[PDB]
Amino acid sequence: HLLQFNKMIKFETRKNAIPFYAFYGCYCGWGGRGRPKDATDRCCFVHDCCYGKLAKCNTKWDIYRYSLKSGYITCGKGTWCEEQICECDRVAAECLRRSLSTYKYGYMFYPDSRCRGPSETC
Amino acid sequence: HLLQFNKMIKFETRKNAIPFYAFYGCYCGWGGRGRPKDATDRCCFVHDCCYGKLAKCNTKWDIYRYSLKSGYITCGKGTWCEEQICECDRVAAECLRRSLSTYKYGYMFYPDSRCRGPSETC
Amino acid sequence: HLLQFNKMIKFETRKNAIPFYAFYGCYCGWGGRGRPKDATDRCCFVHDCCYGKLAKCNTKWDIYRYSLKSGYITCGKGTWCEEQICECDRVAAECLRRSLSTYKYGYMFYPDSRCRGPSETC
Amino acid sequence: HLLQFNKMIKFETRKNAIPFYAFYGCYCGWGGRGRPKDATDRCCFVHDCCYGKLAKCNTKWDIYRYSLKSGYITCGKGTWCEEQICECDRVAAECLRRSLSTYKYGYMFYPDSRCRGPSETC
Ligand SMILES: [Cl-]
Ligand SMILES: [Cl-]
Ligand SMILES: [Cl-]
Ligand SMILES: [Cl-]
Ligand SMILES: [Cl-]
Ligand code: NA
Ligand code: NA
Ligand code: NA
Ligand code: NA
Ligand code: NA
Ligand code: NA
Ligand code: NA
Ligand code: NA
């Protein structure tokens, strides 16, 4: 569920998804086009591709099981859809933490007009 | 969250909450009046009472942590509200499983017009 | 900005966008496909079409000016993009209020698998 | 919200906050140290102090209500935090317009190395 993904983002980065990742670059948040601008944007591009491969799953609201017990995100065992959505979310939240050193406040509210180039393939 | 409670019900009873428990007897699903018709209905009555003690909590939509590891439901650590809601849901799903011996398909879509007895006190 | 649209939804419908409208039917929330299921879903379909005509605007994060002073939502004068985004948001929030009489809790977390029909043209 | 403050700055000064005010002198934009270099820089120093009194508020990202209808910025009614943040932003944007006669393009991208010395008290 998207609120669980936002919790993973906050757990990993210490930043709230709104405003820090919801409008970042060309791919962070809903939708996206063109070329990923940097490492942070590329995490979001991969996440969008990950969800795209799950067309038979309810990626936005299926509530999966996960744990923080070990001091990192672990996806619980469940339905194929729950495990796959959780895995997309976990990978993206960890990727965003790894990309923190190159996060640019200048890309925070990035205009769609700067994302008009050919769209990268998943 | 209601969708997590529905997953607990499926896990414990082996029946989907919709249609098997969402309209059952006088108390299963949202609301309720009169007297619980049987053991299954009484689980739902107790669940309504459990939520009734949590007026300061977002009982229907707060997403809590839980696990199915080792074949039973375990509520994870979180806010006081998450833990309390999870406990209501876990107890009700286990109660519904224990009430399977008297589950009646005839009570599945029970008309609220037949729930005319005095309403039971929590 | 999406947070302003969510405030308009709450003001008009008296329901929070999450969970009541974010996953409703085939078109409410981000994206959509197939045929709108009812009046509420049709508001969301029209909103998607409205935003679709605003490709040169930053529909998700451009913060427009609006007022609730008169007891109704009134869009402030501003840039062409601010006025157009505000107008999409205001019309949709009012449409959702007018559709309240047929709002179905059963359409709340609607699966994409039930939206597989031919997609309606804007 | 910072994007609303940037719209107020544009309305008052006729300059976009990025690049004209976001890196100006010792205090304009995020952070600041030393002594304000000029009237423009002093506006930004006072704005930082204003936000400093609002530690319980989300100064950068809370979306408040404001109007330009009268030909002047007027803060609308809202939560205590929204009203207080809007007041800080309104005062600063007006101050920047009043400081225009001494705006120096030479202070636009001012180096932190020249903001050595004792930091002024709020
Ligand atoms: Cl924001
Ligand atoms: Cl969980
Ligand atoms: Cl499965
Ligand atoms: Cl929800
Ligand atoms: Cl406003
Ligand atoms: Na963007
Ligand atoms: Na995206
Ligand atoms: Na009930
Ligand atoms: Na019933
Ligand atoms: Na849907
Ligand atoms: Na939509
Ligand atoms: Na500053
Ligand atoms: Na500077």
Residue numbers in the entry:
A (entry chain A), B (entry chain B), C (entry chain E), D (entry chain C): 1 to 122
Please quote the paper that reports this structure.
Crotoxin from the venom of the South American rattlesnake Crotalus durissus terrificus, is a potent β-neurotoxin with phospholipase A2 (PLA2) activity. It is a heterodimeric protein complex formed by the non-covalent association of a basic PLA2 subunit of low toxicity (CB), and a nontoxic acidic subunit (CA) devoid of catalytic activity that potentiates the toxic effect of CB, by enabling the toxin to reach the specific crotoxin receptor at the neuromuscular junction. Crotoxin acts primarily at the presynaptic level and induces complete failure of neuromuscular transmission by interacting with specific neuronal targets. Classification of crotoxin complexes was made according to their stability, toxicity, and enzymatic activity, which depend solely on the isoform of the CB subunit in the complex.
In the present work, we report the crystal structure of the most abundant CB isoform of crotoxin, CBd. The crystal structure of CBd was determined at 1.8 Å resolution. The asymmetric unit of the crystal contains six individual CBd molecules. As expected, the structure of CBd is very similar to the other natural CB isoforms (CBa2, CBb, and CBc) and to other group IIA sPLA2 (EC 3.1.1.4). Two sodium ions were observed per CBd molecule in the crystal structure presented here. All six CBd molecules in the asymmetric unit contain PEG 400 (present in the crystallization solution) in the interfacial binding region near the canonical calcium-binding site. Analysis of the protein interfaces in the crystal structure of CBd using the PDBePISA web-based interactive tool revealed two probable tetrameric quaternary assemblies of isoform CBd. The tetrameric assembly of CBd can be considered as a central dimer (A,E or D,D) associated with two peripheral monomers (B,C or F,F), respectively. Interestingly, the central dimer interface overlaps with the sPLA2 interfacial-binding surface and the CA-binding interface of CBb in the CA2CBb crotoxin complex. CBd differs from CBc by only one amino acid (Arg74Pro, respectively) and by three amino acids from CBb (Ile19Val, Arg34Gln, and Tyr115Asn, respectively).
